[PDB]
Swiss-Prot record, chain A:
Associates with the helicase and the primase-associated factor to form the helicase-primase factor. It comes from Human herpesvirus 1 (strain 17). It comes from the Viruses. It is found in: Host nucleus. The lineage of its organism: Viruses, Duplodnaviria, Heunggongvirae, Peploviricota, Herviviricetes. This is DNA primase.
Curated annotation (Swiss-Prot), chain B:
It is found in: Host nucleus. GO terms for cellular component: host cell nucleus. Changing C12G: In strain: Nonneuroinvasive mutant HF10. Belongs to the herpesviridae HEPA family. GO terms for biological process: bidirectional double-stranded viral DNA replication; DNA replication. This is DNA helicase/primase complex-associated protein. The chain holds residues 601 to 750 of 750 of the full protein. It comes from Human herpesvirus 1 (strain 17) (HHV-1).
């Protein structure tokens, strides 16, 4: 709401700014969820194997 | 291990030498623990000596049925440690029973930890003296090779 | 010669018995559910496909295999009717054993079930290959053994509401698995991999009520799992649900008779059965840990 607030009636001189809503949500939450539903990423992220030779 | 570590010193190399030395100490500990696995069934090999001036585990009642074997106990007592069930780790006087012995698996983890404490006591001192380090030498027994005797 | 198998047996009408067996007569157990070599050779020669061959071998087994008559009230004659192997936590694990419980809202045909199993096997091998990097797991010729429980009063399957299956596959060489948590992690990874597959859901998603297939709680010290070729003791008076093999032939199987005869080997459905190597293991990599718990992203972030 702070990003979409204006301070000038003139459309050319409006003080609207791009909204930082989709970017933060897709970068902080949805990327991990996408990595969760792929088998290679799931194995890479969720298990830490330990082997002794 | 000390011979090899102090022989690497004549290479006139900076702190990287200390990292190499730490690697060799860890390798030596690994090899010692691996070679201790083939003697997991030996009860005399792991038994420790106890003098009358140290605290020790109470004698099991069966040890009083040895007979003539109780006569040769002037000074020392050899005690081994076994695991009867789930995390019990009781003590057994080795020399008070007739041979051969039929015992549960030996508690090699406990004895190996006791030995590794003394191993680290000298390795840490060597590292802190030769190169002037400040990091204690610790071997991750629990997360590396504790599964062998579990 | 220890170690020995230790079995828990359900006694009728109430009570439990225990056995510790140095050796047993597995030939008697598997005699009435074995295909002759001539029969499998003729069927393989007639049909060069693999799905049809597996369906017809299952048909031939189902129309032949009898059941054990009601055993005696003694524990020495009941272990041939019911028998469950007890998970020993002091031994290594050389077999991935999965307990599949399918809950249904509508009965499912057998031709659909065979395709569902064939697609399950494709994802299980991918999961195994991801879990064991130093091994070679060919997803076309690796052996995977399937057993299905018999129904309650191309083969026909009249299943009321549930389906019971056992999937047994060897741990790829030169790997071994130790501990109880590691097997739970392996089972969870395999279940996730087979759920993320596409063909399996298209094959079985319509009849399935919930997609929680594999039970990961069967790996614990003292926990018992029923063995194949043994009937489950029904609550009232009979024994039912005998686990008999379902032949899902690998697409690149070279010796079909060997694959068929490997279903009756008692070493292929035991947790700690000795590995089947060729000459000698030059080295073995024991995979002794995979993690502490699941605590998936959603729960951690909510916390
Ligand atoms: Zn059925």
């Amino acid at each position: 709401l702070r990003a979409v607030t204006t301070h000038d009636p003139n459309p050319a001189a409006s003080t609207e700014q791009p909204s930082p809503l989709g970017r933060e949500a897709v970068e902080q939450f949805f990327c991990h969820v996408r990595a969760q539903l792929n088998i290679g990423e799931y194995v890479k992220h969720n298990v830490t194997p330990r082997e002794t030779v | 291990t000390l011979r090899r570590v102090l022989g690497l010193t004549t290479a006139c190399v900076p702190e990287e030498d200390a990292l190499t030395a730490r690697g060799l100490m860890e390798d030596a500990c690994d090899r010692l623990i691996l070679d201790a696995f083939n003697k997991r069934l030996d009860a005399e090999y792991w038994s420790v000596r106890v003098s009358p001036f140290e605290a020790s585990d109470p004698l099991p009642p069966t040890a009083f049925r040895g007979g003539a074997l109780l006569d040769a106990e002037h000074y020392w007592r050899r005690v081994v440690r076994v695991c009867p069930g789930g995390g019990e780790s009781v003590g057994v006087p080795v020399d008070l029973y007739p041979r051969p012995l039929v015992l549960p698996p030996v508690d090699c983890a406990h004895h190996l930890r006791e030995i590794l404490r003394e191993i680290e006591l000298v390795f840490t001192g060597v590292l802190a003296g030769v190169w002037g380090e400040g990091g204690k030498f610790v071997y991750p027994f629990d997360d590396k090779m504790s599964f062998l005797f579990a | 010669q220890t170690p020995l198998p230790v079995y828990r047996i359900s006694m009728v009408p109430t009570g439990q018995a225990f056995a510790a067996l140095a050796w047993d007569d597995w030939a008697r157990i598997t005699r009435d559910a074995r295909l002759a070599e001539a029969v499998v050779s003729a069927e393989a020669a007639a049909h060069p496909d693999h799905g049809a061959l597996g369906r017809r071998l299952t048909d031939r087994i189902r129309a032949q295999g009898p059941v054990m008559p009601p055993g005696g009230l003694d524990a020495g004659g009941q272990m041939y009717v019911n028998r469950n192997e007890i998970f020993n936590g002091a031994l290594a694990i050389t077999n991935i054993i999965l307990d599949l419980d399918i809950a249904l809202k509508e009965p499912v045909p057998f031709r659909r079930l065979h395709e569902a199993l064939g697609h399950f096997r494709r994802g299980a091998l991918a999961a195994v290959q991801l879990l064991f990097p130093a091994a070679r797991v060919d997803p076309d010729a690796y052996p995977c053994y399937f057993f299905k429980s018999a129904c309650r009063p191309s083969p026909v399957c009249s299943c009321t509401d549930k389906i019971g299956l056992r999937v047994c596959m060897p741990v790829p060489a030169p790997y071994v698995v130790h501990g109880s948590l590691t097997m739970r992690g392996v089972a969870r990874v395999i279940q996730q991999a087979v759920l993320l597959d596409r063909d399996f859901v298209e094959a079985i998603g319509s009849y399935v009520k919930n997609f929680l297939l594999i039970d990961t709680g069967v790996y614990a010290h003292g926990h018992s799992l029923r063995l194949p070729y043994f009937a489950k003791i029904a609550p009232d008076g009979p024994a039912c649900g005998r686990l008999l093999p379902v032949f899902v032939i690998p697409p690149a199987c070279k010796d079909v008779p060997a694959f068929v005869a490997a279903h009756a080997d008692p070493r292929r459905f035991h947790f700690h059965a000795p590995p089947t190597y060729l000459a000698s293991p030059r080295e073995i990599r024991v995979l002794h840990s995979l993690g502490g718990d699941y605590v998936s992203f959603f729960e951690r972030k909510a916390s």
